[PDB]
């Protein structure tokens, strides 16, 4: 739903790299190139970013119950 703060396997922070990863993707970078640019050397963290779907953006479409 939202990007996890830490990698499950090793515990390295990945919750501050989703927006940068998206920017690199829009900047014509390959996915692996973006992962290397963000310093994701371990394939656990590479999985944590590459396999993430962001459902919070879809959930933000619905109007809030309380105004």
């Amino acid at each position: 739903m939202i990007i996890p703060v830490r990698c499950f396997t090793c515990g390295k922070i990945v919750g501050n790299k989703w927006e940068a990863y998206l920017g690199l993707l829009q900047a014509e970078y390959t996915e692996g190139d973006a992962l290397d640019a963000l310093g994701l050397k371990r394939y656990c963290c590479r999985r944590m970013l590459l396999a993430h779907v962001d459902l919070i953006e879809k959930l933000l479409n619905y109007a809030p119950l309380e105004k």
């Binding site: 703060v5 515990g11 919070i56």
Partner: protein
């Protein structure tokens, strides 16, 4: 009948990780040091959330847990702070916890990203690692027009043996005998295996010749830090903690012997 005489050798020391080699020590000691790296290094982490208001798409457990996973600067205040179990004060005090406060309302049309910058603490020395003066800030939650987050948090002292959020390591690489001299691992086909980063061999050879009178020495390390502590502080604090645990065990043993 006495102790070893180990030697350290630091190959790479950065602001994120430390590389060092420990020579002339036992495998038990090296693995114990690694285990203490992972699980017995006290750092500061949020462990008490009181959500005043939350209109976001993530529930209160979701929010709290994400806030708890956020690492905080624990370089020096971790020693002065004491565990709330041993603290003689009430539930919280300045000497056993760090205050936090979040207050964000999204009023613009653009989606509001509640990052770790919105975490405001009473302690100037205990701040989120991404807020320290590059890497971006950790996303806690996203808010649209109307949704608002209001919470209070307390950061306590603990080690990874309790929760993984108090673990200060982003990976502890451990390796001995890069060339398989001791035959600890039996390769069915040695030529299929890539050389280690610390291997000292030619390409025509796969592993070192068998050493019948050898024991694991020259243990290699790569202690990546999550930002709560510098890697040198991690290693020093882990060594001190292992020494302290052995000391308490010695005191208990002396008391038990005297009781007999």
């Amino acid at each position: 009948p006495y102790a070893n005489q180990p030697t350290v050798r630091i190959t790479e020391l950065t602001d994120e990780n430390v590389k060092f080699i420990i020579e002339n020590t036992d495998l038990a000691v090296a693995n114990s040091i690694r285990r203490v790296f992972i699980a017995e290094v006290p750092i500061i982490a949020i462990d008490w959330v009181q959500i005043d208001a939350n209109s976001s798409v993530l529930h209160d457990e979701f929010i709290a847990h994400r806030l708890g996973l956020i690492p905080l600067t624990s370089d020096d205040i971790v020693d002065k702070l004491q565990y709330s179990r041993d603290c003689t004060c009430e539930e919280f005090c300045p000497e056993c916890s760090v205050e936090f406060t979040l207050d964000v309302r999204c009023n613009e049309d653009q989606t509001r990203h509640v990052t770790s910058r919105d975490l405001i603490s009473n302690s100037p020395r205990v701040i989120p690692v991404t807020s320290r003066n590059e890497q971006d800030d950790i996303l806690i939650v996203k808010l649209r027009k109307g949704q608002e987050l209001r919470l209070r948090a307390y950061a306590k002292k603990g080690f990874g043996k309790e929760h993984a959020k108090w673990n200060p390591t982003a990976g502890v690489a451990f390796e001995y005998d890069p060339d398989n001299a001791l035959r600890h691992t039996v390769y069915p086909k040695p030529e299929e295996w890539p050389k280690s980063e610390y291997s000292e061999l030619d390409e025509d050879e796969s592993q070192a010749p068998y050493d019948p009178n050898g024991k694991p020495e020259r243990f290699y390390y790569n202690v990546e830090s999550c930002g709560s502590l510098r890697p040198e502080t991690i290693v020093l604090s882990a060594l001190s903690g292992l020494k302290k645990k052995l000391s308490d065990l010695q005191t208990q043993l002396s008391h038990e012997i005297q009781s007999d």
